[model samples]
Target chain A: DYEILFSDETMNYADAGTYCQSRGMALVSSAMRDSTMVKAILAFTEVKGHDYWVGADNLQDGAYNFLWNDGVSLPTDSDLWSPNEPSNPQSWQLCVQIWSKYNLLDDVGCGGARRVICEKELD
Target chain B: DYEILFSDETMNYADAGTYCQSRGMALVSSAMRDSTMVKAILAFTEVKGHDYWVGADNLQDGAYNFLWNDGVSLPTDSDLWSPNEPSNPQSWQLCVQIWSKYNLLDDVGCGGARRVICEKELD
Candidate 1:
């Protein structure tokens, strides 16, 4: 199912997820993490050149407990994060992103007001 | 792949996408639009009875071009829209909902303050 919807503006991590849930969906996951996938995503929705949400978070520290909407953890060595990123585990970071060349995860506090991505299953 | 998060409070559609994009994710897609999925999403987040965001939008004209994050058009005969809803295409609406019994689609402006849903893929 290839559909996309952009967020209004910025919002806290939890709130964004909740908003998605109410509509019978969850924040966007990383099952489609790749250059091609990203491009297709950009083409579908009204992104307007900005960052949105993804379903990656470091809320559980050390464990690197990152999972997707399908209840599966990424291969741990996924090529999505930016170098030296997801390192600032000062607190529970709820959002994840793909910076320049690597995957990056940041504290929800700092990434507040950032855009997010959501996904759902087909009937 | 069963994780969820909420938004800070409120945001527009484009901004939300930007925020999520910066993190490498797009607004959620509706691959799991069911009651069981909705329950799991609610349990995973800290929702305070407020609406957040979702991937559904009516930004286009007639035709109801509803698709998912995967870039695939959801089956025209899917069980997502609220009964007798999606009826209002006054302007370029850009949001969807699951009111009580049926699925629903509405204009973005009215559902601005409402919650949203996002999703992503796992590497």
Candidate 2:
């Protein structure tokens, strides 16, 4: 189990990380890679029906080369992505969001405002 | 990392479990629920292009309710499944196989011959 915090306000990707940091947590990262955790998270978000910032981005190499905030590579063709997503054709789409349209991960601009999901593993 | 053994010969599901047990390992189960491990496993199997058994089945409760060897419930609608699979409509297809067709999990008759994938976690 994990201790999760869903932000009441939306913020840009960087600010979302700051928001989570302000609390004793970090933007949800490795958990996003876990299938069970992803399902539970999406289920909760399905009720809120809002896009949320997760800790994955392609700022390092772009072209769908995303890395979780914890420094783990998020596979380019991972099933975690929404269909045809990470469509960083121009490479400007850097940050990742849990796109509400499909309740799946997608690449979007880091500056876009979105709710944050912060997480800390239980002791 | 793990010590994984892909069988050199086909065997029924029960025999596969016995084979792995004899080797001080067990049929791959919990690893199948992990996305990264699943990707790696599939990548290796893709080259072999053969159906291999992992440890998931519905012998306890049919209707797609599968349990891994470690007694973890494999979510019914997990992406681990191929398109329209777990297709246990008749409810007799009680065993799980990494179907070569999609390199994704599928339910099939336990008595059928298929290669085994066994795993022992590294220390």
Candidate 3:
């Protein structure tokens, strides 16, 4: 089984991923949108009350081409994305976030600091 | 591999366990003592700066029958325990806590609220 965690601290997307690395986690991956784990994660991230970085990113390209740590691109049909998101993509808008107000995924600059959701499987 | 979470809010032993459950975690168990996880947990708990509840408890006996949720009694030689602890055992001292002053384990009243360390394994 997999478990989820939300951090009270905030950091840029890159640093957040690095910190998760120290803790043996990566920003939560595409597990959410895959219908594999999103429901519960969305529920808790709402309670924690903040925008959060997920491991997905459009790092090498903008054009809405975000990929998870395992190299899977964010699905085109996934509803986890907010309306008009990745809509404002720019060179700096590489990291992905679970936006607070709408509780939907949004693309934002990797340089901006934010909280994060992390997940790992149980033994 | 498991992750450690230190919460800012305080709750009684059972509630603390439930809190961890809600997050898909549990009070960290004695896996920490079996030549496994103690070093890192101890280091992080010390940095978190407060007494913490590890899942181990002496709920059924005053003879320091401290057990993890998984039903393993604390190892007598495990150094995670503080000196002279469970030494104050009484009917009211049911759950256990890591003493804040020294970051060492101690027996305590279950009703006495404190922070917690929770763990669940990774994928």
In terms of TM-score, which candidate is strongest? 3
Sequence-dependent TM-score of model 1: 0.41
Candidate 2 global Cα RMSD: 13.8
> Per-residue alpha-carbon lDDT of model 1 for A79-115, expressed as tens digits?
5555554555445544564332322433233345665
lDDT per residue (tens digit) for residues B1-123 in model 1: 322333444566666666556555666554355455444343222223334455555454324665554555644455554455556554555455433232233323433554445555433
Tens-digit lDDT track for model 3 on A44-96?
A: 55544568889888776665777887788787456888887766545565778
Instruction: Summing lDDT over every window of 10 consecutive residues in candidate 2 chain B, give the lowest-scoring window.
Output: B1-10
Rank order by lDDT, top first?
Answer: 2, 3, 1
The candidate scoring highest on DockQ is 3
Give candidates' CA RMSD values in order: 15.4, 13.8, 12.4
TM-score of 3: 0.53
Q: Model 2: how far is A67 from its true place, Å?
A: 40
Q: Quote the true-contact fraction of every model.
A: 0.00, 0.00, 0.00
Q: Rank the candidates by TM-score, best first.
A: 3, 2, 1
